[PDB]
Amino acid sequence: GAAALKNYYEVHKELFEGVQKWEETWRLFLEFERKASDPNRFTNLKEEKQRAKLQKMLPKLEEELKARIELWEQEHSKAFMVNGQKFMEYVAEQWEMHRLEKERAKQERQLKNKKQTETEMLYGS
């Protein structure tokens, strides 16, 4: 009845609050990531302590949220979806895209530097 329905909605509101906290923390983390990774910074800051803080928070927020989501899904036989996706899959996707983006930026610089030496040798005077 109404007791069980209160619990449904209260726990679900809690899941959404965890989602919003995770997203906040993630987007702040990515801002510091961009600054820390900026090529311009050599010719452009205890923001490392802060960057590191957000970094340590994230997996803790994820483990807590993961446990609550699963509890709620099992009890109510429903998938917990956010913006059309199981939220923890969205979380994993975000991390891997970030990881891959970081690699791809390194790789582009690598290939660019390599072609620069190639072209300087083939056509240089």
UniProtKB/Swiss-Prot annotation:
Superkingdom per UniProt: Eukaryota
Function: Key regulator of cytokinesis that cross-links antiparrallel microtubules at an average distance of 35 nM. Essential for controlling the spatiotemporal formation of the midzone and successful cytokinesis. Required for KIF14 localization to the central spindle and midbody. Required to recruit PLK1 to the spindle. Stimulates PLK1 phosphorylation of RACGAP1 to allow recruitment of ECT2 to the central spindle. Acts as an oncogene for promoting bladder cancer cells proliferation, apoptosis inhibition and carcinogenic progression.
Quaternary assembly: Homodimer. Interacts with the C-terminal Rho-GAP domain and the basic region of RACGAP1. The interaction with RACGAP1 inhibits its GAP activity towards CDC42 in vitro, which may be required for maintaining normal spindle morphology. Interacts (via N-terminus) with the C-terminus of CENPE (via C-terminus); the interaction occurs during late mitosis. Interacts (via N-terminus) with KIF4A (via C-terminus); the interaction is required for the progression of mitosis. Interacts (via N-terminus) with KIF23 (via C-terminus); the interaction occurs during late mitosis. Interacts with KIF14 and KIF20A.
Tissue-specific expression: Overexpressed in bladder cancer cells.
Region feature (Spectrin-fold): 6-125
Entry comment on modification after translation: Phosphorylation by CDK1 in early mitosis holds PRC1 in an inactive monomeric state, during the metaphase to anaphase transition, PRC1 is dephosphorylated, promoting interaction with KIF4A, which then translocates PRC1 along mitotic spindles to the plus ends of antiparallel interdigitating microtubules. Dephosphorylation also promotes MT-bundling activity by allowing dimerization. Phosphorylation by CDK1 prevents PLK1-binding: upon degradation of CDK1 at anaphase and dephosphorylation, it is then phosphorylated by PLK1, leading to cytokinesis.
Location(s) in or outside the cell: Nucleus; Cytoplasm; Cytoplasm, Cytoskeleton, Spindle pole; Midbody
Biased composition, class Basic and acidic residues, residue ranges: 105-118
Free-text note regarding domains: Microtubule binding occurs via a basic patch in the central spectrin-like domain and also requires the unstructured C-terminal domain.
Site note Tubulin binding, residues: R41, K46
Shown stretch of the complete protein: 341 to 466 of 620
Family named by the database record: Belongs to the MAP65/ASE1 family.
UniProt protein name: Protein regulator of cytokinesis 1
Coiled coil: 45-122
